[PDB]
Amino acid sequence: ETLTVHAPSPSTNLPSYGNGAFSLSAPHVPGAGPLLVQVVYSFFQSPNMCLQALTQLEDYIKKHGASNPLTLQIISTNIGYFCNADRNLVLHPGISVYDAYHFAKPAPSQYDYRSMNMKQMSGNVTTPIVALAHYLWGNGAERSVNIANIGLKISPMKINQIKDIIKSGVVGTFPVSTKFTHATGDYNVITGAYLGNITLKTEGTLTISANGSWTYNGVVRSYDDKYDFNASTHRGIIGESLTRLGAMFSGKEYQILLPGEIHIKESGKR
C-alpha cells in the first residue's frame, strides 16, 4: 500500500529544493572546466531537466527510503518548484524555463498547492512533474493543456488516408478528412509522459505535383475530448519514472482536456 506525500505549502516546504543538499542543474562534464550559466540555461529548456529532477527523487527514495519523513518533504518541496515554474510559464508565455524556474514570484520555497494550483498546464518541459503533482494532490480534478502547446510533429505519410493518396500515384489536389492515432512518446519524451497515445482529427488539402512532390495543409484537433492520467497511459522514459513514483505514493487519477487546434504545413517527396 501507498504512502501519502503532503501537499506543498509554506508551512511544510523545506527552505530549498533538495533541502539544499542537491539542486537541479546541468550534468558534470569532466575536463570542461567550470559550469557556466549559458550551459545551465540551455539545460533548463531541454527535456533532460525534467528527467533529472525525477531521477533525483527516485535516487533519494532508494537511498533514504520512501517512508523517511525527509524523503516525503523533498518530494513535496521539489515538485512544488516545478508547479511554481509551470505557473509562471502559463502566465508569461514566451519566457525561458530557466527564468520561470529561478526568478518567479512568489519564491518556490513558498509554493502553496491548495491556493496556487492551476487547472491549465504549460506543455513545457516542467509539465510531467506538474501532472504528477495533480495525481498526488489534485483529488481527481480535471486539467487541460492546449494542443498548440504539446509540440506535435505530424507525419502525413503515417496517416493512412494521406499515405494512400500519395502512394496511389495520383497528381492534383485532394480533400483530406480523417482521424488517426498519434504516439507522442515516439518522438516527444515530455508530451509522451503524460498524454502518451492520443487520437487526432485532421481536415485539409493534399497537393501532389507530377514530380511526386507533395504538401499537406490542414487543421489538427484532438478527436477524444480528454485523456486519462494513470500509470498505464504514460509513455517514454519520463513516463516510466512517473509510473514507478505513482506506484509508491497515494493519489487519484484524473483526466486532461486537449482543447484547441493547430494549422500544419508538411511536405515530402514520393
UniProtKB/Swiss-Prot annotation:
**Per the record's keyword annotation, is Protein transport included, yes or no?**
no
Mind telling me which Pfam families this protein's record contains? Colicin_M (PF14859)
**Key word Transit peptide present in the record?**
no
Supply the alphabetized keyword list: Antibiotic, Antimicrobial, Bacteriocin, Plasmid, TonB box
Its Gene Ontology biological processes? defense response to bacterium; killing of cells of another organism
* Function field: Colicins are polypeptide toxins produced by and active against E.coli and closely related bacteria. This is a calcium-requiring inhibitor for murein biosynthesis; it causes lysis of sensitive cells accompanied by murein degradation. The target site is possibly the cytoplasmic membrane.
Further remark: This colicin requires TonB for its uptake.
Name the chain's protein: Colicin-M
The organism is Escherichia coli
Which lineage is the organism of this entry classified under, starting from the top rank? Answer: Bacteria, Pseudomonadati, Pseudomonadota, Gammaproteobacteria, Enterobacterales
